[model samples]
Every structure is written in structure tokens, then in C-alpha cells.
Target: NLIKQLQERGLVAQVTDEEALAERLAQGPIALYCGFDPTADSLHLGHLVPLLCLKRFQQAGHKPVALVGGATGLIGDPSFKAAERKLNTEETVQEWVDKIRKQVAPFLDFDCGENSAIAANNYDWFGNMNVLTFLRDIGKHFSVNQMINKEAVKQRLNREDQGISFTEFSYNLLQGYDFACLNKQYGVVLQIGGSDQWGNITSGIDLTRRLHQNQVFGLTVPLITKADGTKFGKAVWLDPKKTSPYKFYQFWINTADADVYRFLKFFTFMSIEEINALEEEDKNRAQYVLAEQVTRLVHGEEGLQAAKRITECLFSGSLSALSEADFEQLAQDGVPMVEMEKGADLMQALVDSELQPSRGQARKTIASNAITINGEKQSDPEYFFKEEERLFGRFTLLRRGKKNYCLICWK
Candidate 1:
């Protein structure tokens, strides 16, 4: 039933065997795990697919385990890569592991009874093992020919200057062992990942069967892409520090009509019936619904409201309409801010704010009625930012044309 739901949403990219997986899922709640390599300090939008998939299983009354790749991060996964990755220091990987663990914790319910979620680090198991034991215990199960035939390896080997290091080539073995270790320790019966990870996921299943002689499942979700054929997820980061909540909200709200419905189903917890109903309704309203649902899910209610407030205030050219807290958040998160003297000349302010490169351009734009202070046009080059123009007694918004905006903070 859950498989059908995922299939309808265009999320299921590949599975080991639909019939067997469906039957196994129907039998009872089973522990499943997905591994995230801690190569960066924050999980980006591309990571949401697997993270959200884990949530889907958790909601289905199954145990969900998020495995941060502490040990594996040091030996980057070469899957689908044209070249080997530059490895991170153990200290750097450990720091990222902690960040990713905190980032992933909010998505699942840790306190919810028998199937409560778990957060694990691969370093815990890999740290104490000697290299000889690893080769003997885990490496023996893998066949060199089979590993070479995998698509990720094939692609790299086919490259003109192909260089596949032993460390990267053996990534599948480590990941497979991760699955086997989890299966042994936690009774994890399934593994899920992106479609690009299909080979690695299946390798884990094969490893589990060879080690424990148990049949486990592997599933993958489709990679998200834009309708315009451009890469998606390059700009959206889950870390608010990397991409502000306001910008993140805007990204979803600006979704193309062709991709919005699919995204709503993939990203939101909204029921299929409700999403279908939204599809048949107003298109613009559907965008807003998707934006709000997804933003609230990621950033929580306070963050969602702050995003909406910033959007509304900027669009309507009404800075005073925002509350004090909203104005502060908008200044910090939504607009680029420059600190200037209280009585700075408006032309110089524009230059200082980097809204215009020079005083000449600033004056010309002001003359052309394209420059505004606090959303009010100032035709005079002699204009100066006064205390009355400041929002929340600290910030002034400078507008260049319709879309270019900057915040000026007078100290």
C-alpha cells in the first residue's frame, strides 16, 4: 500500500523486486537505514530525497535509522564520479558528522515508542576494526569482476584520463558492510537511496545475503530536476545559515506549474487526495500551498511566518507593515545590509550599500526615478537618509529598479 503511494508520487525510481518488497513491507514494520556522507557541513536540497524517504518509512510504523558516514567521508564514495574525490581530514569529517547528525535529527520522531528513529555514525563500527580483519571479514565477500562491472566504476574507467583509486573503488565494499553491520546489530531489513546510488544499494543487499544469508530490499527515489532541464538543488541548502529561510520559501513558491504538483507530493506530508484536489484547483493557490507546507516542514512556524512577512513587505513596498521582529529577521536574512552614517548622502549611501558602483551612477539612477529610499523615490541627488525613513529605528531599504534591494543600517 505504501509502495503504491510512493509509486503514484513518482518517487520510486528502482526497487529490487516489487512483488517481494511489497509482500515484505506488508508483513510488518521493519528497520531500514539510509547513509549520508558527511562531506559537507550541511545537507543540501539533493539530500532531502533520502532523508524524506526515511521519514516516509518512519510514518509507516517502521523504524528509521539515519547513518552519517563519518568513516566513509574520509574515503569519499566514487559512485557516478568522473574522478576520485579529495579526502577530508578525520577532524573535519568528525565535525561535519556532528553537524549532519543535528541537521537530520529534527525530521524523525526519536521518542515515538517501539519504532522510534535512530541516528548512527559508521565510525563507531569501523573505528576499532583493523585493516587486515576488514579485508578478511568483509572484503572477501565482494567479487572484483562484479564490482568493476558496476555503472559507477564503468563510467570512470571509460574516461580518457580515468583514475580510480583503490580507496574510492572499494567504497561499495564499505557501504555494503555498513548495511551488513546495521542488519546484524539493528535487524535492519531495507536500504534506500537516490537512483544514482542503485548499484551501491544493491551491493549492500548482496553483501547482507552473503553474510547473514537473509534477503533484504533496496529502493531508490528519482533525482529531482527542473522543468527547464537545469540542475535543481544546487542552490537550496537545509542550513538556514547557508540559505535563509526567506529565500528557501521563495524557491518553492516560484515553482513552475509543470513541476509543482510533483514536488508537492514528493516534499510535503499532505495526503494524495488533498494534493490531487489542489491540482484541480487554482494554479497560483497550488504554488502557495506547496510553498507553505514545505517551508513549515523545514523551517517551522516561526520561520515560515518570517518568510511570508518578508515576501509580503518587499512585494507591497510597505516596510512599515512588518513587525519589529519581522523587520529584524528580514534585515538579517532577506536583504544585503550595509552600515552607514546616520546623515549619509543618499547618492553616497547607494554607493556604500553597493546598490550602485559610483556616485555618478547613483545620481543618474536617482534622476531616472529608479532609486528609492524606504520605497519612496528620491529625485534629488542631495537627498539624505533621515531618522524618519528608518524601519524599526535602525534599517532602511534601498531599492534600485524593481527587483534589486538592499538594506542600510544607520548606526
Candidate 2:
């Protein structure tokens, strides 16, 4: 049921052996794990697939292990990666690990008894290891000849400009030992990760059997996708500090019609029936539900309400009820915002806000009664930003034509 459930949600990319893994899952509540790399302070939307996969198992009465790759994150996994390297000193990497550890807790039930989620770090094992024993005991079982043939890294191995480093080349062995180590520590029988980890996952599976003579499984989740976005694109972030709750909601609300339903299945836990029934709902309604569900999941109910409140405020063409926090969300990096000193000329503010190209255009816009200072149209092009006009006495809303808004923060 867990296997088919993940497969039905479009989460499965490849399983090491489906029938055997299914048989194993059915026997009892087995332990399965997925590793997360603390490459950033916050978990991006892409990591949710495997995180939810852990939830799927937890719901099916299996213990879930959440491994933060303290050892591996420092030397990022090179498989299927086309980068030079992330040069991290130990301290900064530990900061990232600390940041990511807290962010993952909300996704799994940690205190629900026997099948409760477990947290582990490869650092526990890798940090104290000696190279003397590492080379002889752990490295002995891996085949360099076979590793060079691994499709994920072989091109880099063969390439001239970006030849694989001895550091990255040894990643296979470092990560492969993780499975053997976890199996012995937790009786963890299954490993899961993003699809790119297929090579590393298989290596670990083989090393697990070679070391312990135990049959373990690995299932990789499909790489989360987006519509054609190549030339120069937009980024959606999970961090509320980076992408405000309102902006995050807007990203989901803007999902393409063709991608929305598919995204519901991938990003939401809306019983498969709930998602399939979305076909009967219009695309716009589906997008709103997607936005609400994901925004609430990432930002909590309050943040979602803030997003919804802002949306409705704008829809009604009034900025009256927006809290200072709401205005800050409107001023976030992705939105239109211009910082203006109090008493700056309204015409200059308009030009600076980029709603109008030049001072002359600003006069024309104001003269035509198209400029609004805190929701009231300003007829005079010569007016300065009065403190009286500032909403909340600290911020101003600039509206051009019917819909464009530029938030101004007073210094």
C-alpha cells in the first residue's frame, strides 16, 4: 500500500526492486529513511516529495528516519551534479545543518510512539572515523572500476575541463557506507532520496549487502518539475524571510493551468480522490486551493490569512486594512517597492517607483488623476509626500492607472 500510494502520487522514479520491497513493507512496520543535504538554510519545495514519502510510510505504521547529511553536506554529493564544488568551511556548514534541522520537524510525527520519526546525522559516524581503518575496512569493498562506470559521474570522470576531484570521486564510498552504517544502527531496511541520488543510493544498497549480508531497498522520488523556464527565470523560495507568505501564495496562485492539477497530486496530501475531483473544479479554483494549501503548509494558517487578506484588500481597491506586516510582504524582494524619504516630491517618487518612466510622465499620470497616495488620487503633480498621507505613518502606497502598486517605505 505504501509503495502504490507513493507511486500513485507521482512520487516514485525508480525502486531497487519493487516486488521484494513490497513484500518487505507488508511483513511489518519496517524502518525506512531519506537523507537531506543542508545546502541551504531552508528546505526548498523540491525536498517535500521525499519528506512526504517519509510521511506516507509513517502513516502506514513504519518508523521513519530523517538523516541530515552533516558529513555529506560539507562535501556535497557529486553524482548527477554539474558544478565545480561548494567550498565550505566546517563552521558554516554546521550553521546550515542547524538551520535545516529545525525546518524539517513539522513534516513528520515525532512523538506518535513506536513508529515515531527519528533524526540521525552521518556526522555521528563519519566525524570520528580514522582514515587508517576507513581505507582498509570501508574502502576495500568498493570497486573503483565499477564506480568510474557510474553514469551519473562518468562524464565528469572523462571530461577534461571539469575533471572529477579525488574528493568528489570518493563521495560514492562515503555515501555508500551510510547505508551499511544505518542498517547496523537502526535496522533501517529502506533508503529513499531524490532521483539524482539513484547512483549513490544503489552504491549504498550494494555496500549494505556486502558488509552485513542484508537485503535493503532504495526508492528515489521523481525530480519536481516546472513548465519550460530556461532563458532567465523566476525562483520560488520556502523561506518566509526570503519569499514572504503573500509572495509565496502568489507563486502557487499563478501556476499554469496545465501544471496545476498535476502539482496538486505532487505537492499536496489531498486524498487522491480530492485531487482527481479537482478536474470538476475550474482551473482558477484549483489554483486558489493549491495556493491556500501550500501557503498554509509552509507558512502556517496566520501567514496564509495574511496572504489572503492582502489579496482581497487589493481586489477591493483599498489599502485601508493592511497591517504593517502586510505592507512589508508587499515590499518583499519579488514585489514592486521603492524606498523614499519622507517629504520626497510625489513626482520624483513616481519616477523612482518605476511606475512612470520620467518626471514628465509622472506629471501626466498625476494630471490625469491616475496617481494614488495611500488610496486617494492626488490631483497635484507638485505635492510632496506628507506624513499625513503615509499609511501607518511609515509607509505609502503608490498606485498607477488602475492596478499597478509600488510600496514606498519612509526613512
Candidate 3:
């Protein structure tokens, strides 16, 4: 049923054998896993597919194993890259592993009944392995020529500028070993990843068969691409530090019209009928629905509220309506902030805030009724922001154009 739903949502890109996977799912719960390398402190939007797929399986009464690649992270996966990745230090990888674990915990139910989700580290096993043991045990199963024939490997190998490195080349061997290890230890029978991982996934499937002499499954979800032809998942990351919650919310809110419908299906848990009903509706309203659904899923209600308040403040030009706490948060995260003296000249403040090019530009903006200080139109270029005009006696909200905002902080 979960697999059928995934197919309906257009999530499935490839499966080693669809009918076999379907039969396996129908037989009852199976142990399935998706490995994530701690290449960065934060998991990007790209990771949501495999994660959501894991969640789907878990909800269908299957065990979902989230394998954080503490070992493989040091080596890095070379699935879709044009060049080899820079290897991270063991300490850095460990730090990221901790962070990734925390980031993923909120998505999957770890305390639920029969299918309690597992968050495991490959380093737990890989750390105990020696070079000779690794080479003899795993390396013997892989053929150099066969590995080189893999699409990702072939692309990098055939590149004109830079060829693939040995370190990156052996990534699949390590990944294949991971599958065999998971299968042997946890009875994990299925692996899932992005479409780019077809080569790597098949390698794991083959490795598991050779090692255990049993059938296993590998499925890949489609790589999300934007209609505008920009890099889709790279534009947004999960960490609040890398991408602020407000910005994250706005990213969904600003989804392209052509992409919003498919995104809603991929990202939200909305029913088919519910999504289809909005087809004839206003595109702007539909985009907002998609935005709210996804922003809530990713950032929770508070983050969504903050994003909504920011949008409202900008739209209504009523910055004063936002509470002091809200304004402070917005100013810190969203608006450009400039520090100035209590009685700073409005024109000079505008130029200093980078809201205007120069004093002449600031003066022109004011004369044209385009400048506002704390929601009040300031027609005088000579006007100074006195202490009384400061919101919360410390902050002043400035607007130069329809949606452009700057926060002036008085010392």
C-alpha cells in the first residue's frame, strides 16, 4: 500500500524489481534502510525523499533503519558529483554525524511499537575493521572493471578536465559493504536512495546476494528538479544557521507555479483529492497552501507563524503591528540591520543602511513619498530619528520601497 501510494505521488524513480518489492511489502514488515553520510553539519532538502520514504515504510509497519555514515562520511560518496569531494577530518565527520542524528530524529518515530525506528552509525562496525580484513572480506567481492563501468564512475572517469580519484572510486565498494553488513546484522532486505544512486544501489544488491545468497531490494526516488532549471535541493538546507526558518518558509512560498503541484504531492501528506481540488484554484493561493503545508512540516507552527508575520508586515507596511519579540527576531534574521546614534539623520541613516545609494538618493526617495519610518511617511530628508520615534526605545523600522526593509538600532 505504501509503495502504491509512493507510485501515485510520483516518488518512485527506479526499483531493482517492482513486482518483487511489492510482493515483499505485501508479505509483511521488512527491514529497510537508507544511508546518509555526514558530509555537512546540516542535511539539505535533497535528503527529504529518502527520509520520507523511510517514514512511509515505518508507518506501514516495517522497521526503518537510518544509517548515518560515520565511516563513509570521511570518504564521501561520489554518486552525482562532477569532481571528487574534499575529505573531512574524523572529528569533523563525527561532529556532523551527531548533528545529522539530531536533525533526523524529529522526522521518524523512534519510540513507536513493533517498528521502532533505529538510528545507527556505520562507524560502530567500520571502526573495528582493519585494512587487510576490509580488503580481503569486501574488496574481493568487487571487480575493478565492473565498478568502473558504473555510470557515475564512468562519467567522472571520462571527464576531460579531471578524472575520478581512487578514494572516491572505492566509495561504492564501501557502500556495497554497508548493505551486506546491514543485511547480515539487522536482516535489512531493502535499500532506498535517490535516482543518482542506481549504480551504487545495484552494487549493494549484488553484494548482498553474493555474501548471503539471498534476494534483496533497491529503490531510488527521483531527484527533484525545479522548472526554472536551477539546482533544486541545493538552494535550501535544513539548518536554521545555513537557511533561516523565515527564509526556508519563503522558499516554499515562492515556489514556481509549474512546480508547486508536484512539490505539494512530494512534500506534503495531503490526500490526492485535496491536492487535485486546488488545481482550478488561484495559483497564488495554491502556492501559499503548498508553502504552509511544507513549512509546517519542516519548521513547525512557530516558524510558520514567524514567516507569515514577516510576510504580512512587508505586505501591509505595518511593521508596528509586530510585537517587540517578533520585530527583534525579524530584524535579526530577515531585515538588514544598521546601528546608529539616537538622533541620527534620516537621510544619512537611509544611505548607511544601504537602503539608498547616497544622500541624494535618500532625499529623492523621501520627496517621492517612498520613505517610511516605523510606518510613518517621512517627507523631510532633513528629519532626524529622535529617541521618541524609536520602537521599544531601541529599534526603528525603515522602509525605502514597497517591500524593502531595514532595521535601525540606536546605541
For TM-score, the strongest prediction is 2
Candidate 1 achieves a global lDDT of 0.87
If scored against the real structure, what TM-score would every candidate get?
Answer: 0.92, 0.95, 0.93
Model with the higher TM-score, candidate 1 or 3: 3
lDDT of 3 by residue, 1-411 (tens): 677888888899988788888998999989999999998898988898788779878878999999999998988788878777878999999999999999998989989877899898889888888989988988998999898888877878776576777788888988898888889888899999899888888998999888889789998899988988987964578876777677787788888888888898878878877887887655347789987987888889987887798778777877766777666666566678888887679888988999889998888888899988877888987887767778888888888867788888788
lDDT of 3 at 181: 85
Candidate 1 lands at a TM-score of 0.92
lDDT per model, in order? Answer: 0.87, 0.84, 0.84
| Ten residues in sequence with the least summed lDDT for candidate 2 | 227-236
- How many Å off is the CA of 409 in candidate 2? 1.4
Candidate RMSDs in order:
2.4, 1.9, 2.2
Question: Largest lDDT belongs to which candidate?
Answer: 1
lDDT for 349 (candidate 2): 92
The predicted structure with the larger lDDT, 1 or 3, is: 1
